[PDB]
Design a protein around this ligand. Sequence first.
Ligand code: HEM
Ligand SMILES: c1ccc(-c2c[nH]cn2)cc1
Length: 391
Amino acid sequence: KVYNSIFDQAYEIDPIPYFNFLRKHDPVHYEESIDAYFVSKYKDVKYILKNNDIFNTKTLAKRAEPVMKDRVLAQMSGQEHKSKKKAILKGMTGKYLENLMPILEKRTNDIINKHIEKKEIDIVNDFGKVFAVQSSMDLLGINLENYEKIREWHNGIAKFITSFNLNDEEIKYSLECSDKLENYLMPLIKDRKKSTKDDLISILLEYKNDENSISDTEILALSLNVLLAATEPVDKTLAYLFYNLLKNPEQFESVKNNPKLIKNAIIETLRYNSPVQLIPRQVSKPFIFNNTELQAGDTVICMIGSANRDPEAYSNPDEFNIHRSSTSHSQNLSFGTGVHTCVGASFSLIQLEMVAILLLKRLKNIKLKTMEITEHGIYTRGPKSMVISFD
Ligand code: HEM
Ligand SMILES: c1ccc(-c2c[nH]cn2)cc1
């Protein structure tokens, strides 16, 4: 019998002591409430994610279908997955990327311009929440007329994607969010169909696989997948980045003095406070990790934050240090690994660096006003608020 549960209230408050207990004493940990095994060690998480044939993404189909309306990218495999992942990458690289970043600079500067005279800003609620959804819509090609309603509908769909055992009233609200978003987006996919632009929806629209376009509802599903994914972790990461730097003045100074260190500071923030905390997989056949037996059909959930703090992977893993280099250092698992590694990983780092540079440039002598954050979410996780002041 076990007494340390992922679903104790203490875990969401502060999961770090759970990571340390689980890695040492129960590295493949069963939770009866969701009939799943939680996997906490870097080596086991890496092996599971690298072996797409033994640990497959069928678990995601059950948690994605009701709100995304058709198959998402992580559910695909083989040539379909490879080619469609490439199409998605295309919208955020090359000339698509060069066109997009000035627009995201405009989004950044318009937010700053709204708060600059107030001499404080909430990096979570004033900047990240607003910027993340506008950014996703700019990437997709959706005009910002309705970013108010899009934000609301994104939030309900995210709640569904990132929760366990929701109550019937909650599922209802999340499905009405998903319907409203579909009711909004479907006509635009059809307008883009005969008036093609240079955005991600147009890429999906002109995608062809053996002279066979993908259905409109498949395009909707992929677009919904990108909208949700490009929005949710990016805003948490930005707030974590400035909180961690401000909580370590010496490292904030090194960043200020040498802006090239911002990328390393972003990477270390993703390692330290992994915003996507869980990755589920289904076990395809009998299998054993450590001495825990798994059966075909079992669910394993990789614990990204725990893996990224594994002392087998990193020296002093529970310390934030932007100067980590190279066991005492490994590649973090913040973006996963293997077949389903985050298509938006490079774009994420570029987005966050350009936003970080503008905040440092325009807000002078930043000081922390939220001296102690509170964090929420066990699937995705971030501060509820993170206020700074400036000159
Ligand atoms: C800090 C920001 C981000 C983090 C921490 C993050 C994290 C992750 C992780 C851990 C995975 C692996 C999921 C799995 O293996 O099942 C993933 C996959 C994915 N991410 Fe992100 N992501 C970020 C930003 C983005 C952005 C900006 C996009 C824009 C499209 C995006 C889209 C995707 C997609 C489509 C997948 C599925 C890719 C595939 O199945 O091959 N992500 N992400
Ligand atoms: C749940 C699972 C994965 C994500 C995700 C992947 N890439 C960006 N965001 C968001 C919510």
